[PDB]
Design a protein around this ligand. Structure first.
Ligand code: NA
Length: 426
């Protein structure tokens, strides 16, 4: 029959600043690492950049109206650091103006803001000083977080310090797929530490300012599974440490995974990054945990990622059982689909099927006492898919980049029904 969610369950959709905003060179905005990276020959498919994107900086009013039609109770978006700290030693109070306008529209339509402080658009001038590998980044982030809390505080009840440390560190500085696109494990592990430390500083600052809302981190988690024989179980443990425990353990247990740190030191040498007090600051109590879930390791979406909703069920139980009794929010979940407009409609049935499977997994967790409080679909609209540019589409709303026309997909109409019914009804 019907799978009905809790009465107070928070239904949302999510975006990120560089991915939708455009207006990259307006209002004094300085370049981010992603401006530099996308503008570098060879780094992003077809040479796509986030100059323009969905032109959301300008079109926010109409976008919010689509959100009101959808019926989301919360909209998760990110704050553009480069609009506020565009160059070394320069602060633009006006850089938060857009967010103030956006938030007014949200409140007008009874939508709660959920603001992500850092979703990867580090100002280029900080990267020029070593970026996340430099300890001084912690103070720069603190300065930005401080101004965000002061500018928006009262109007934002739900704050996310950091989006996906694994990507901002390991994928960005170690693997080199994302800005700033370096290949240096020591640098990447230094970045991981400083991202985690900056999270903790922001939480501390939030308490000290006496704000009344909630603050937490968002982690992408990719459950690993063994193929089998003791070596396969060991392989699973290595993968799990690399993707998941490297971030979960410090946040919740105030230590890095001791099984994996020797491997890190083997390939990086001494990180020379952990200072006394750091691990305590990283493990400061949060109000909630945000998780971004897409797939597992060890049929597929348009990204070629395995569809495996059981991994989400297992993951939520793992968090409950091993890590935290805090409220969990799925801050992202979604799928790429090879979408086309036929007669002004987009029939993205595969996307519907994917979200239905994941919400069923979530519903099962809730039924078994799981403290899952909210779900945000990635994404509200098609957008700049990082290294893939505009070539991959995750939206429940189609965006023609030539015309900027928004066309709600079948998935939009389906999710609207899910929200209206507060659950699955098939
Ligand atoms: Na990144």
């Amino acid at each position: 029959g019907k799978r009905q969610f809790p009465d107070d369950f928070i239904w949302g959709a999510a975006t990120a600043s560089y991915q939708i905003e455009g207006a990259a060179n307006e209002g004094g905005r300085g370049p981010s690492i992603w401006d530099t990276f996308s503008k570098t020959p060879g780094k992003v498919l077809l040479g796509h950049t986030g100059d323009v994107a969905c032109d959301h900086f300008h079109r926010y009013e109409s976008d919010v109206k689509l959100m009101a039609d959808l019926g989301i109770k919360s909209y998760r978006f990110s704050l553009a650091w480069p609009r506020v700290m565009p160059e070394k030693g320069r602060y633009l109070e006006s850089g938060f103006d857009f967010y103030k306008r956006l938030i007014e529209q949200l409140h007008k339509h009874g939508i709660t803001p959920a603001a992500t402080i850092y979703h990867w658009d580090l100002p280029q001038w900080i990267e020029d000083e070593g970026g996340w590998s430099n300890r001084a980044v912690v103070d720069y982030y603190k300065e930005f977080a401080e101004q965000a809390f002061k500018a928006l505080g009262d109007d934002v009840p739900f704050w996310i310090t950091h989006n996906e440390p694994w990507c901002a560190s390991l994928l960005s500085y170690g693997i080199g797929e994302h800005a700033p696109g370096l290949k240096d494990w020591r640098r990447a592990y230094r970045a991981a530490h400083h991202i985690l430390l900056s999270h903790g500083e922001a939480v501390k600052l939030y308490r000290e300012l006496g704000l009344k809302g909630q603050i937490g981190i968002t982690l992408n988690l990719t459950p690993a599974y063994p193929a089998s024989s003791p070596e396969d179980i060991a392989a699973q443990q290595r993968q799990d440490a690399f993707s998941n425990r490297w971030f979960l353990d410090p946040i919740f247990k105030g230590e890095y995974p001791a099984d994996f740190m020797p491997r890190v030191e083997r390939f990086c040498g001494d990180l020379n990054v952990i200072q006394p007090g750091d691990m305590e600051t990283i493990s400061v109590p949060q109000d909630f945990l945000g998780i971004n879930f897409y797939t597992r390791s060890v049929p597929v979406t348009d990204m070629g990622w395995e569809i495996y909703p059981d991994a989400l069920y297992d993951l939520l139980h793992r968090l409950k059982n091993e890590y935290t009794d805090l409220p969990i929010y799925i801050t992202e979940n979604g799928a790429a689909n090879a979408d086309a407009i036929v007669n002004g409609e987009v029939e993205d049935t595969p996307r519907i099927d994917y979200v239905r499977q994941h919400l069923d997994a979530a519903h099962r967790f809730i039924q078994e006492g799981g403290n899952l409080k909210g779900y945000y679909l990635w994404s509200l609209m098609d957008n700049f898919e990082w290294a893939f540019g505009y070539t991959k589409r995750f939206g429940i709303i189609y965006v023609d980049y030539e015309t900027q026309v928004r066309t709600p997909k079948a998935s939009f109409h389906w999710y609207r029904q899910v929200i209206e019914n507060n659950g699955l009804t098939d």
